[PDB]
Design an enzyme around this catalytic site. Structure first.
Site, PDB file in Angstrom:
ATOM      1  N   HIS B 170       0.834  -1.166   0.000  1.00  0.00           N
ATOM      2  CA  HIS B 170       0.000   0.000   0.000  1.00  0.00           C
ATOM      3  C   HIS B 170       0.869   1.214   0.000  1.00  0.00           C
ATOM      4  CE1 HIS B 170      -3.128   2.911   1.648  1.00  0.00           C
ATOM      5  NE2 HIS B 170      -3.733   2.413   0.585  1.00  0.00           N
ATOM      6  N   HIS B 174       1.032   4.035  -3.462  1.00  0.00           N
ATOM      7  CA  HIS B 174       0.801   5.450  -3.419  1.00  0.00           C
ATOM      8  C   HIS B 174       1.998   6.160  -3.975  1.00  0.00           C
ATOM      9  CE1 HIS B 174      -3.017   5.844  -1.186  1.00  0.00           C
ATOM     10  NE2 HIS B 174      -2.681   4.719  -0.583  1.00  0.00           N
ATOM     11  N   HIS B 201      -7.964  -0.017  -4.748  1.00  0.00           N
ATOM     12  CA  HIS B 201      -8.627   0.044  -3.479  1.00  0.00           C
ATOM     13  C   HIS B 201      -9.783  -0.902  -3.461  1.00  0.00           C
ATOM     14  CE1 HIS B 201      -6.174   3.645  -3.114  1.00  0.00           C
ATOM     15  NE2 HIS B 201      -6.284   3.528  -1.802  1.00  0.00           N
ATOM     16  N   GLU B 306     -10.334  11.169  -5.110  1.00  0.00           N
ATOM     17  CA  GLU B 306      -9.230  10.889  -4.231  1.00  0.00           C
ATOM     18  C   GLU B 306      -8.953  12.000  -3.258  1.00  0.00           C
ATOM     19  OE1 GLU B 306      -5.693   9.915  -6.171  1.00  0.00           O
ATOM     20  OE2 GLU B 306      -4.499   9.519  -4.334  1.00  0.00           O
TER      21      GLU B 306
END
Lengths: 313, 313
Positions: B170, B174, B201, B306
Site C-alpha cells: 500500500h 501510493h 482500493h 481521491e
C-alpha cells in the site's frame, strides 16, 4: 357478444390466490412470458416500488400486445398461473381499461375481489369460521362494526379513512394513470397525467382536512422532516392470500434506510426538486434545461415527483 | 556501478531521525526551501492531508529537477537534515521511482526502514531492551506473536490486516501514483491513475471481504453515514523516533470537525459528486461540462474522488 366477453373477464379475476400452482411444464414456450415471473406469488406486490412496477409494466405490455381479445384471454389465463397475483390484477386491470378489444368491459370489484383488504381480520375470520362451523347452504352475515375501547381520537376519522369507496377509488385511479405508463409503447399518451397526479392527491388531502375540522381537529401537518418519528397505526387486515397480514406500525422511531434506498438519497432528491423550482428550469437527461412554463410546469413536476416514466430525469 | 549507487542511497535513508539536527546556522542558507519550512521533523507526516502533500510535492520536484544523479544525492543529503523525515522518505522514493538516473535502484524496504510500523511496540522495546540489557555482539531474536485474551473476533482478520507485505504494498502503490503528481512538471503522465486508484482500493476491499467470509463473518458494510460512531482499534505501534505512538481509538463517539475541515463539508462533496454522476457530466473550473464518458469516466471520477491534482475541479 359483449356480455360473453364480460363473462370471460370475470373468471380471469376469480380465485386469484388459488390460481397459483403454475401447472406449466415450461415457460420457454411462452416467449412472451419470459420477462415476467420474477416476483413470487405469495409475496406482497408494491404499487410504489420501482422493480415491482417494472414487472407490472412488462406484463401490461404483453396484454396490450395481444393481437386479439381471444389471444388476450389466453395469455392472461396462462400468465396468471405464474406471476404474483397482485401484479396480475394490476396488469390486467390496466389492460382492460385501455385495450380497445375490451370495448366491452368492467373489471370485477376490487372490494369484492379482495374482501380482506376492505374488511377487518375479525370479520374475515368470522365469515370463514361460520362457513366451516356449520355446513349449510344458508347465508352468513357478519357485522364488521365491532365493539372496542376508543383510545385514539384519530379513530374518529376512520369513517373517512377506512371507507371502502375511497380505497377502491384510489386503486382505480392509479390504474387509469399508471406511473409505469410508456407512451411510446402504447402509442397513446395520458393527457396531463403529471398534473392530475398532483390534483387528485391534493384533493384527497384537502378533503381529509375538512374531515378533521369537522371533527374539531386541527389540519394535518406535513412530513416536513424525515428525522421525526411516525405515529403508529394498526390496520387489522389479514391478507387472505397468506396467513400474513399487513404489519402494524407501533409508535415512534426515526427513519431507517432500506437496502433499496437511503434517506440522504431521499432528502437530496427533495432539495433538487425544490431548487429546480426556484431556478425555474429542470435539467433533462440531455442536460438541456426545460423551463417550468406556466402551462407545462405542473405536469412536468408531477412526472418527476411521483415519479413516472415520463420524468425528464 | 548502479549497485554502488544502491549502497550509498540505503545509508542515506538508514536511521532518518538522527540525521536531523539541521546544523546550518542561518535559516536563509537554504533559499531552495524558503517556500516550505513549515512541518518540523518529529511530527507525523500525513499521506492524505493536502498541506503535507504540497510540501512533499515541492520536495519531489527538487529531486526531479536535479540535473544529474550526483546532484540528486547532494540535495537529498542536505535536504534530509532539515525536512520532516516521513516527508523525506516519501519524496525520495517518488524520485527514485521516476528519475531516469535510477534503474535497478530499489529502495530500502519500508518494513526494514521503519520496523516500528510493522511490528508491535512490545517486540520493539523488548529487542531494544535486549540490546541494552547485555552488551554482546550476539544476535537477538524476538518472537512478535505474543500471548493475550482475544476478546474481539476482528482479531481473526489480523493475519490479513496486520500482514507486513500488504502494508508495504500500500505504501509503494501510493508512491507510484502520487496524488500530488503534476504531469506538467514531470512532463510524463501516469496512465489511468484515477481508474487505477479505484481498482486497487476496490481489490483491497474485495480481498478483505473474502477473508471475512472465510472467517464466517459477514461482509463489511460501508461507512455511509457520517453520524455513526466508529468501532475502536488500538494499533500498539510505537514511533521510536520519538516517544510517541499512534493514538488508539476506542469506539462509540460520533464525528468531529477539525480545524482544517468540517464534516458537513465532507457530506457536501459527496452530494456534489453524486449529482455529477447522476446528470452524467462534471463541471470543470472553466465551468465547462465534461461528460462522464464510458471510456474516460472512471478515470475522471478517480481523480476527483481521491482527489488528485488532476481533479477537474
Amino acid at each position: 357478444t359483449v356480455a360473453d366477453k364480460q363473462a370471460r373477464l370475470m373468471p380471469l379475476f376469480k380465485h386469484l390466490t388459488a390460481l397459483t400452482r403454475e401447472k406449466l411444464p415450461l415457460d420457454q414456450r411462452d416467449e412472451r412470458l419470459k420477462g415476467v415471473g420474477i416476483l413470487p406469488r405469495g409475496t406482497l406486490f408494491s404499487c410504489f416500488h420501482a422493480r415491482h412496477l417494472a414487472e407490472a409494466t412488462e406484463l401490461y405490455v404483453a396484454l396490450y400486445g395481444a393481437k386479439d381479445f381471444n389471444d388476450f384471454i389466453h395469455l392472461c389465463e396462462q400468465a396468471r398461473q405464474i406471476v404474483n397475483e397482485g401484479m396480475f390484477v394490476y396488469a390486467v386491470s390496466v389492460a382492460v381499461l385501455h385495450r380497445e378489444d375490451c370495448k366491452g368491459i368492467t373489471v370485477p370489484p376490487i372490494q369484492e375481489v379482495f374482501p380482506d383488504r376492505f374488511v377487518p381480520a375479525e370479520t374475515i375470520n368470522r365469515a370463514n369460521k361460520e362457513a366451516s362451523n356449520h355446513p349449510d347452504q344458508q347465508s352468513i352475515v357478519v357485522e364488521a362494526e365491532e365493539t372496542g375501547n376508543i383510545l385514539d381520537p384519530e379513530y374518529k376519522l376512520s369513517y373517512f379513512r377506512e371507507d371502502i369507496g375511497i380505497n377502491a377509488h384510489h386503486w382505480h385511479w392509479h390504474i387509469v394513470y399508471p406511473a409505469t405508463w410508456n407512451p411510446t409503447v402504447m402509442g397513446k399518451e395520458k393527457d396531463r397525467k403529471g398534473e392530475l397526479f398532483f390534483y387528485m392527491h391534493q384533493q384527497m388531502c384537502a378533503r381529509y382536512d375538512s374531515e378533521r375540522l369537522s371533527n374539531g381537529l386541527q389540519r394535518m401537518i406535513p412530513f416536513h422532516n424525515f428525522d421525526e418519528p411516525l405515529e403508529g397505526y394498526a390496520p387489522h387486515l389479514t391478507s387472505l392470500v397468506s396467513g400474513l397480514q399487513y404489519a402494524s406500525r407501533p409508535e415512534g422511531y426515526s427513519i431507517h434506510d432500506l437496502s433499496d434506498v437511503d434517506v440522504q438519497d431521499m432528502v437530496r432528491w427533495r432539495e433538487r426538486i425544490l431548487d429546480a423550482i426556484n431556478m425555474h428550469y429542470i435539467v433533462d437527461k440531455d442536460n438541456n434545461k426545460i423551463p417550468l412554463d406556466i402551462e407545462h410546469g405542473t405536469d412536468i413536476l408531477g412526472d418527476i415527483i411521483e415519479s413516472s416514466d415520463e420524468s425528464k430525469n
